[model samples]
Target: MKFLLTTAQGIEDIAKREVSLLLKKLGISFQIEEKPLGIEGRLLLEAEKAYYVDEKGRKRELSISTYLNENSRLLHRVIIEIASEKFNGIEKDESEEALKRIKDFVSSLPVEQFVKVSETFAVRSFRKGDHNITSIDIARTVGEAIFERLSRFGTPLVNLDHPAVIFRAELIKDVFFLGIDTTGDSSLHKRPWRVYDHPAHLKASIANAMIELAELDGGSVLDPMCGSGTILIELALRRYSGEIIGIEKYRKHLIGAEMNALAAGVLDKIKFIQGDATQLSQYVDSVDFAISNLPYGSMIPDLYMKFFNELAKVLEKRGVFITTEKKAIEEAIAENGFEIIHHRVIGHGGLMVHLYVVKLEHHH
Candidate 1:
C-alpha cells in the first residue's frame, strides 16, 4: 500500500530517518521517497503487505497508516493515497472551467471505495503555489463531485465533525492528489503539554530534529537561549539518558519553561536555569551536546559572538542551531574555531530558517 506522510516543512530529512528506522524495526520492507511532486515535508512510501498472527490464532493484516499516525512524533499526518496525478492542463482566465476540471479529477478517483454512502465523510482541501481558486473552493468542488456521484443512488451526507472518512484533496502546483487522512483535524505536533505558549517557540518537530542532529550517547545536553525549554523537554520525552539543561535569559520565560516541563510530566528530568546564554559557562560547566533555536534579529552580532565564544568553551562535542541569520552564525563559527559539519535551509511554511550542525575543531 502507498502512503503520504507530512512533517513540519524543513525537517523532512529527520522525519525520513525516523520513519525509516521505525519501518526497519517493524521488519516491514518499504520503498520511501522524499518530497513527492517537489513538495517539502511530504514523503511517499510504498510498503509491502505484511500480516501477523494474533494471540487468538488469527492472521491480521497490518495497517501501516495507523501505525505511523500513532507511533511517529515527527510525522504531522499520515495519508493513504487513493489517486495522485498531474493536472497542470488547467490554464488561467477561465476560473469555473479550472474548478470543473478539478471536480472531474476528484470524481474519477476511488473515494467511494473507502467511504460508504451511509457513512459520514468530509473533504479537507490544501493547496500550494498560485491558484485562482481557494482551498475552500477545492474542498467544496470535491464534495460537489462526491455529491454528484451520490445523487445517482439517493442522497449524499457530509458531516464536517466526526467524519468516518476524511478525504484530503490537495493541489501542489500542477499535481493533484486525493488521499484518506488517518490523522484527523489536529496535527501530531500539537503536544498536549504545550500549555505555556512561547511567542517564538520552536515547533516540537524542529526541536526533535535538533535532538536527532545532536546524536547524543550520554553526558550532558544544553540549550542556551532555550526559550520555553522546547529542546530539553523533547529530549526528556524521548527518554534521552543524559543530563538536560536549558538557559533562558528572561526569568518569566524560564518559569514558563518549568511550567511546560511540569505539564509534559518531565519537570524532574530538565534543569531550567534563569540566566544569560551569552554567559553559558556561568550556568553549566560543560556539555556533551548543545542545541537551540536561536533568535536571529533579536541577538545582534556582538551578542552572538559573545554567546558563541562562551559556547566554544562549554560545548564539548557538538552543537546544532536553527536561525535565519546565516552570515552572523557563520562568522561566529569561523571566529570561534568551530567546524560546520552540515548546514541547510529549512522552510517553515513561509519562513526560511537555516540549520547549522557544528563541531569544535580539535587543537594539538
Candidate 2:
C-alpha cells in the first residue's frame, strides 16, 4: 500500500515535514518517492523507507525503494506499504460495526481534502517490530476488519488511497483512513506560463487581481509608468473586448511589451506606442482605469509626491489607479485630490510590496 500527498507552491518543505511526522508518530512502516514541482513551486515528498508501529507505540525501519525522485512542483505523489491478512468466517454484523467506527474517525479530522474524496488506496500488513508491537500489526488488524465488511459491496472500493489497509487493535489512539490515490497526478503542476518570463516590474496575478479589485470594465487601461510594456501587453488586442490603450516612453521597453503581449496571447488587445507616461496625452484621451507598479529601486531618485502627481495627471473622471510602492506611493496619493479606495500588501526577500488603489474624481 502507498500514498501521495500534494501541497501549495513554496510550501513543499512544510508538506514533507507533515508527512514524515505523521507516519513516524503512528509507528507505521512505509516508503517514499519524490514527485515534480507544481504551481508557485512546491516541494513533493515520497516516503519509501518502511517503518512499522509496534504494540507499545514504537517504530521500526525496513528496506525500501532503491531510488528516490528529488526536487518537484507544488504537486506530489507517493506509494505506501500495506499487507493483506484475511479473517475467515467472520460475523457480518461485528465486521460492519468496527468498519463504521473507523470511517467515522478519519472523516471527523479537520483537514482540507479539496472535497475530492473519489480517489484513494488501501494496503494490508500484520508485521510487528522485533522488540515490541509495531504499527504494521495494528494497521493489518484494522484493514482486515474493513475488508471483511467491504466484501459485501462485491466490487472493489473506489475512494481509498491504496488497496492494502493496516490494522492494529492496541494502535487505536486516533482514527485512520484507508484507500488509493486516484488523482494519479496533481492538477496544480500543469505549467503553461513557464515558456516565457515577464519583466521585473510585471505580475500576471497582480494584473488579474487588479482588474477584479478595481471593478474595471474594458473602457480603457493605462500603465503610465509602463516598463517593458507589461500593462500594454496585459490589455492588448482585446480592444474589441473593450481593452484600453497604453503609453510608454522608452522604445526598448515598448518592444519588450509588444513581445510580452504577443506571448501572453493578447497583442490584439493592446496598442503600444512610444511616449512619456508622465507627459503623454497626445495619443489617447480619457481612460477608465490605470494600473502600475511605481518604478523605483536603484533606478531614479525623485520624491514620492512627484510620482503620484504624474500618476494623477492623465486619469479620466472617476478613473482607477493601482500602483505599487514607489517610496512616494502613499504620500503622493494623499496629496492629490484622488481618494484611496483600497490598500494591499505583498512581500519578497525583505522587500515590501504595497498596492495603493485610488479613485480619481474631478476637482471642480
* Top candidate, metric TM-score: 1
TM-score of each: 0.95, 0.45
Best by lDDT: 1
Model 1: worst 10 consecutive residues (lDDT sum): 86-95
Q: Clash number for every model?
A: 0, 79
lDDT of predicted model 1: 0.84
Question: Model 1 over residues 293-362: C-alpha lDDT tens digits?
Answer: 9886644788888889998887778899898888888899999999999887887657899999998988
Runs off by more than 4 Å, candidate 2 = 1-201, 228-240, 298-304, 317-327, 348-351, 361-364
- lDDT (0-100) at residue 328 of candidate 2? 59
